[PDB]
RNA sequence: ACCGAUAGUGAACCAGUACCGUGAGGGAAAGGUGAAAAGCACCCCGGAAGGGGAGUGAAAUAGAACCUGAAACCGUGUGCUUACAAGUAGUCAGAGCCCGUUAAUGGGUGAUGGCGUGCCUUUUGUAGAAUGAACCGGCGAGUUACGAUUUGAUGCAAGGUU
RNA sequence: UAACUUGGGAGUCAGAACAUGGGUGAUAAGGUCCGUGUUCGAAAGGGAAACAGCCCAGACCACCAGCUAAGGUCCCAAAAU
RNA sequence: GACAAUGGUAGGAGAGCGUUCUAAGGGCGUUGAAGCAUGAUCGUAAGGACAUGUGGAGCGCUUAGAAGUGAGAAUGCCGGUG
């Protein structure tokens, strides 16, 4: 059985997110949680909701034991941007686009 | 009254697209560049089946001057030897026999030495 | 004749010469006037004479 | 397509020579070995693969040089660096490292490919006249009028 | 082993074996002989002038089909000249039974 | 001063081959806090 | 034998509106759930957002950015290949390894070898170090009314037409 | 195997190199201006190492067939050490 | 069919492929239309059919006619993304 969870318009870039997945994936389920908070970013905080959630429903929705359960299928994935402008030296403006992420995780037993 | 193009448009871009497989990079998804490649491939090909018949014409007499190297024999007093008697038989054949056997190129050698 | 069976005469009708639509109808960039002068002008030539 | 047979890797046999180079000329002798271990002289050969034999040269330093040009025969070089044409030789190699005089004659006949440097490090080439290429059974090869 | 000469060019064969060849005017499930020999060497070798004689071989048809199509395509540059055409070009097919009659 | 050409999408990830993280030490979970 | 949401009106919706200018005056963007609101009662993770089950429905990968949903661009997985190599990037030839088709002389990857200086416009002549093009997508240039002169086809003919 | 006439419809008026006969220049210039012919222009494919005009030669499409021009036959690289 | 000829810029002449509407005739569709994605398909070219998936209400075929009738480039205009 294979449960999943996604984070939904997260207000974070993708590509700061993907360092972090790289070392979540192919790996036990409480050998994640360990990693994530010894890991000094704020990517780590919302990755941790976000296994914990398809952990929750592989014990009320579809009867799996913690014991052993591991990690599949992580990856984020592009959103929508909010497009804003800082002004300049001359009467010029320039560009800034704030970017957003979906999240997705999948634990799976053997 | 009024013609607003469709279909026709990304129809024709994806006959080419579809051509452009194999290659690198933007050169299988941009047209303006996919054109441009699929045309020099058509120049090229058009000029490499005038030129393989000029390829393997080298080989079937790269592979004579080894042959009869070994009986005492150049390519030239060899080709010049059946002249006389009147074998007309390809490249291409002296190839695949002189690959296989030395009984037949022992006397098809010989008649060719024989009439100088 | 019972309006789809309808075919008028031999050489009566013709179509037309459209004009900057390509290169294989033999009139595309240029069509007709050639290079740049006055004759290749929008509102060119003379009055005759 | 058609009747063409092509050699592969299976369909090869490779051999060990020898040859001898006392009362030779250097490059009359290398237009004649630089063939052999490229194919010719087979009827196998094809233009995309090494079929090709193995060569061993003996006795390199009883080698001529006709009319007067261990003196005017130089052989430059450069490293590089501004001011750094080394003319290092002019006929001296016969004398030292003639061990390698005779292996860049052989080495600018056969081509530069990714295939023409790798059938020319099946030479060897030796001013003694002795090799340790004998668990081969290196045949000996008499040479061309 | 034996030589033939076929349209335009040469062949050789042996028996089993298919041989194609440029078109030929026959229907199909029927024969045809190749009056055309050159060269037999075998073990009984024969080889001289052309239309060695005494070898006319037999075999049997096949297939009547047309081959796959390819493209044509030329170009000058910086000159508004071009074309395209396509081909698909016949063939024959036959198999080898016995080589004289 | 300028770029002259546009980047590819190889030469972006050839050289992000290093661009990653690293990972925390590893006591009994335990934190090393010396 | 008129347009059908970049069209038709400057405006199918909040339009002479927001916004720009001391002023006179200039000017936009933006349509679609389903037959029916029956618009997801209830349980679980979380501070909330959002997601997993259940349940309405003919279908929720039709859940209020909701009819369909291409391309550029960004990613996860893996069948063949790549760390001695000089490349307008592909073409013809050609072994191996992995599959099995609108059933045919099959398809995908390609260790090696030969040839090979992009496209358009301007010019006696351009790979050009002469111009223009970041990439994808939509729109975007010999027409119509009156007169003339020639060619073609037709109807009546020393007559022919309003 | 071509021309002559009449009628409908166009484009062009910056030309280059090579060889040859002559002015101008300094028997200087891939000079500049006239005359007679071949090729580029609007023409690909072979040879002159690479090369718009130079020597041979004029591409309907297809084939793994064959005979000779210009130039060429020790090896790179096909053909007489 | 025994000879034959066919490289092409400016430019002239000839035969046709496709898009939207209209008229007449005959037909296909909730046992799944147009459109969209895949494919190893046929024709001398532009271009045409067949199956398989998503889609969920309107499209072809034969013959003639009428045109806002085909785009890769304009330091081209509008939107999206590198
Ligand atoms: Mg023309
Ligand atoms: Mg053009
Ligand atoms: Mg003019
Ligand atoms: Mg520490
Ligand atoms: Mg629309
Ligand atoms: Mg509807
Ligand atoms: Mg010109
Ligand atoms: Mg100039
Ligand atoms: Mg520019
Ligand atoms: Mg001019
Ligand atoms: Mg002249
Ligand atoms: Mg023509
Ligand atoms: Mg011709
Ligand atoms: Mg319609
Ligand atoms: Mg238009």
């Known amino acids: 059985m294979e449960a999943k969870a996604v984070a939904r318009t997260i207000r974070i870039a993708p590509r700061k997110v993907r360092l972090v997945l790289d070392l979540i994936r192919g790996k036990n389920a409480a050998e994640a949680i360990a990693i994530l908070k010894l890991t000094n970013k704020a990517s780590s905080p919302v990755i941790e909701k976000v296994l914990m959630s398809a952990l929750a429903n592989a014990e009320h929705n579809y009867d799996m034991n913690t014991d052993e359960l591991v990690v599949k299928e992580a990856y984020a994935n592009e959103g929508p941007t909010l497009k804003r402008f800082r002004p300049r030296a001359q009467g010029r403006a320039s560009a800034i686009n704030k970017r957003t992420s979906h999240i997705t995780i999948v634990v799976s037993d053997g | 009254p009024r013609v607003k193009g469709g279909t026709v448009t990304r129809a024709r871009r994806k006959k080419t697209i579809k051509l452009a497989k194999g290659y690198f990079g933007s050169k299988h998804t941009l047209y303006k560049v996919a054109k441009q490649q699929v045309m020099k491939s058509g120049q090229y090909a058009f000029r490499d089946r005038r030129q393989r018949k000029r390829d393997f014409r080298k080989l079937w007499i790269t592979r004579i001057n080894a042959a009869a190297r070994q009986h005492e024999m150049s390519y030239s007093r060899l080709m010049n030897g059946l002249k006389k008697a009147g074998i007309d038989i390809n490249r291409k054949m002296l190839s695949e026999i002189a690959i296989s056997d030395e009984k037949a190129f022992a006397q098809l050698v010989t008649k060719a030495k024989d009439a100088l | 004749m019972k309006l789809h069976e309808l075919k008028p005469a031999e050489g009566s009708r013709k179509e037309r010469n459209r004009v900057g639509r390509g290169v294989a109808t033999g009139n595309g960039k240029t069509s007709g006037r050639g290079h740049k002068g006055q004759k290749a002008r929008s509102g060119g030539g003379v009055r005759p004479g | 397509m058609r009747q063409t047979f092509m050699a592969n890797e299976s369909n090869i046999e490779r051999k060990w020579y020898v040859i001898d180079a006392e009362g030779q000329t250097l490059g009359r002798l290398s237009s004649e070995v630089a063939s052999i271990l490229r194919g010719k002289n087979k009827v196998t050969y094809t233009p995309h693969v090494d079929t090709g034999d193995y060569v061993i040269v003996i006795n390199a330093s009883k080698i001529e040089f006709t009319g007067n040009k261990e003196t005017d025969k130089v052989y430059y070089r450069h490293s590089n660096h501004p001011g750094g044409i080394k003319s290092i030789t002019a006929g001296e190699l016969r004398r030292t490292n003639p061990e390698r005089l005779i292996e860049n004659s052989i080495k600018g006949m056969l081509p530069s490919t990714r295939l023409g440097e790798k059938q020319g490090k099946k030479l060897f080439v030796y001013g003694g006249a002795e090799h340790p290429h004998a668990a081969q059974q290196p045949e000996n090869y008499e040479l061309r009028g | ?101 | 001063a300028v770029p002259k050409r546009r980047t590819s999408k190889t030469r972006k990830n050839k050289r992000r081959t290093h661009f990653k993280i690293s990972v925390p030490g590893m006591t009994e979970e335990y934190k090393l806090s010396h």
């Open chain 5, 1 to 101: 082993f034996a030589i033939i000469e076929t349209g335009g060019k040469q062949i050789k064969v042996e028996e089993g074996q298919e041989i194609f060849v440029e078109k030929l005017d026959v229907n199909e499930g029927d024969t045809f002989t190749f009056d055309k020999v050159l060269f037999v060497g075998g073990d009984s070798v024969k080889v001289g002038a052309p239309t060695v004689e005494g070898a006319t071989v037999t075999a049997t048809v096949n297939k009547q089909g047309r081959g796959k199509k390819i493209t044509v395509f030329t170009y000058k540059r910086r000159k508004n000249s071009k074309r395209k055409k396509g081909h698909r070009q016949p063939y024959t097919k036959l198999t080898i039974d016995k080589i004289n009659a």
